[PDB]
Amino acid sequence: GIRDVPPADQEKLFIQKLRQCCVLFDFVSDPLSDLKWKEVKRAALSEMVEYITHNRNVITEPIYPEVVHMFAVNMFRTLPPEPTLEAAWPHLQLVYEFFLRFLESPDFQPNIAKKYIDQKFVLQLLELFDSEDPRERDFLKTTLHRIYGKFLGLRAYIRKQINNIFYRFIYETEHHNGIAELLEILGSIINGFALPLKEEHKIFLLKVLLPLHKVKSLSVYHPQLAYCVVQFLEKDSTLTEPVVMALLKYWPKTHSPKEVMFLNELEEILDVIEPSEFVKIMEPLFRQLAKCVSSPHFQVAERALYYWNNEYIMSLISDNAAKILPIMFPSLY
Template identity: 55%
Template sequence: MFKQFLSKLPRKSSKSESDESPRGDSSGRSESPRAKNNRSHGGNEGGKSNAGKRNSSAAVFPTGSVSLIEPLVPFKDVSSSEKMNLFVSKLSLCCVAFDFTDPAKNVVEKDVKRRTLVELVDFVSSFGSSRFSEPAILAMCRMCAINLFRVFPPNYRANNRGGGGENDDDEPSFDPAWPHLHLVYELLLKFITSSCLDAKVAKKYFDHSFISSLLELFDSEDPRERDCLKTILHRVYGKFMVHRPFIRKSINNVFYKFVFETQKHNGIAELLEIFGSIISGFALPLKEEHKIFLWRVLIPLHKPRSMGVYFQQLSYCVTQFIEKEPKMASVVIRGLLKYWPITHSQKEVMFLGELEEILETINMVEFQKVMVPLFWRIGYCISSLHFQVSERALYLWNNDHIVNLIAHNRQVILPTIFPALERNSQSHWNPAVLNLTHNVRKMFVEMDEKLFLTSQSQYKEEEAMLTLESEKRNEAWKQLEHTASLKPVVGNTAVLVSPI
């Protein structure tokens, strides 16, 4: 088995190389890069016939330059001029994939690969003499693609409900291959962040296809893998400026699919965390593209039931937008009111928490644009029978900035929420909510006693009118029932009868 493992390495004498690298002679000499480049552009008929193979995703390794390097030789045992060739050869050795679900299978080969990966990580960390060659970049991309890019089987996400959803307390799933995958991720991260990697050359290999494959891995159920991916994608975004619009667009597509189609994805929190850093780097004034992202992506992300899994990251992104451009505060509040949960009390508590963060930074002009519908909704929360919702809404009056906004607009706000305060003080079942309600009522009395008494009088008048209308309806129904009871029953005609 070990011989088969090593036999997969590309060598001059191997059949696979003879198929992909046809030669005019049978000598064992290595080809120069210039000769290989000429042949790839149609230098002979053999090169033309195999152009499709060289252009495929399984790109040909620069085997001609490494065929005489034994991959198990330590880096310290070769000269500086040969270290890059040995690096490529060791990457080639790591392109063999194993089944990690069976710990007793290929034990020796797995250990060789693990030690090789550790050696590669150390080499990249300490490499600082020159730039990584183009064959080395190609070899790194291919090795990562073979080891990392995979499709998760259906049962891998069978119990997934949006990265947690109703099963937030469930234990996360851990990939049995993680000790091996972790080394590959660490090597990729070291390679991308290395000062010896030329971004202008590497952008050809860390291309849109590579980035898309990385994004697909965010649906992994292993939180350790998602954390590594988060760091790597953030570094890719910082390293390759030319790919930034594509990365943003691709992440947006993941969000769109999650919100409007599946509502199932494990990596929403990590992707939002990446976007939080991206938003902090937006230049002012904000581009229209970024404003559209806020309205069409971030605000609809409040809709799924599993919002609690990524709420902190989502709230951070929203507040970052408002800090960048305060005029967006009223837009965000309207969006929250649009997606306000009616039957999900825990989400309602989270919405109130996010609302408080927004109100802490909002200016008076933006506040006045939304205060009527906002406090109409807060009034409903105050009178909620779920004590946590009512309690969280009343806690808004513990914030000095919010109290100052309310005080300056009390002529509009107090009449809007007074019915909720009055109903709470008369009939709410929870003692803590009753105490908070009395405190808020006392604050309004201290703000403007005359307005408070006027609102109280208006509330009593409205309640009297409602009572009178209710009595009229009851009387009308009684008259209908009496009239119907006097008429004889004919056939199968339905009639109103008085209750027994």
């Protein structure tokens, strides 16, 4: 290991390995090519992971630019046009692992690192969320979460650029492989919002999160989206009417199994709803619920019927029985 040469020589050798790992190998054209050198690079990456994991005061000031340059050269690249996996994963996996341990080390000083981990770095990182490889997206997700946490100065930039990605997805391409992972990061951020909610965030709910419900591939990221929406209503109950009315607007207009995820989101909203907000939206909500109960899709009908077994929802229905019963049972009440 690096640990086994004299302490005077260790930084030099560490830098030397980081630079060797800037050599890039092709795993696609000829997959049996250069196996000896590929292994040399894998072992060097693995050695550097161990070295920063098991030693202290080894991330010195000259290490920072070398680490960031090594990451960039390996990771910032044009992406190709069940899932398609990244053939270079045997190396990229270890670069992600090492960079993560770099960020999480007790030696790590954000006041030094911020000179190299900047808006440009975050821009290029965020482009990689469109990777087809779910393992890459998973490492990216964790990495960006760590960066957002440790770099206060980058937080506004990260939020804005995720919004740019979301806007292009909604209004242009309707195709992006990592919406779910980005919403997962946003969920953790929304949960930490202070009160009262900044106007920036309410705009983000109303202009970004709600319109995400209209994109045809919604089912891929819907659980993560619902979680973000519910967190907003736990923070500020006065946003209930615009959220519920928008959800009702985006509700499928043919009977569909996709209504199941809409019923899930809506029940999760009702679980945190205030009685006075409930009365505002109960009539349109239960008109939709009545249609779902009568759905010719068995799973939709059953799913809607379960609302009656939610004790809290039933207490709200029962306190407003005179207005809700005639909607749920027109030929009776």
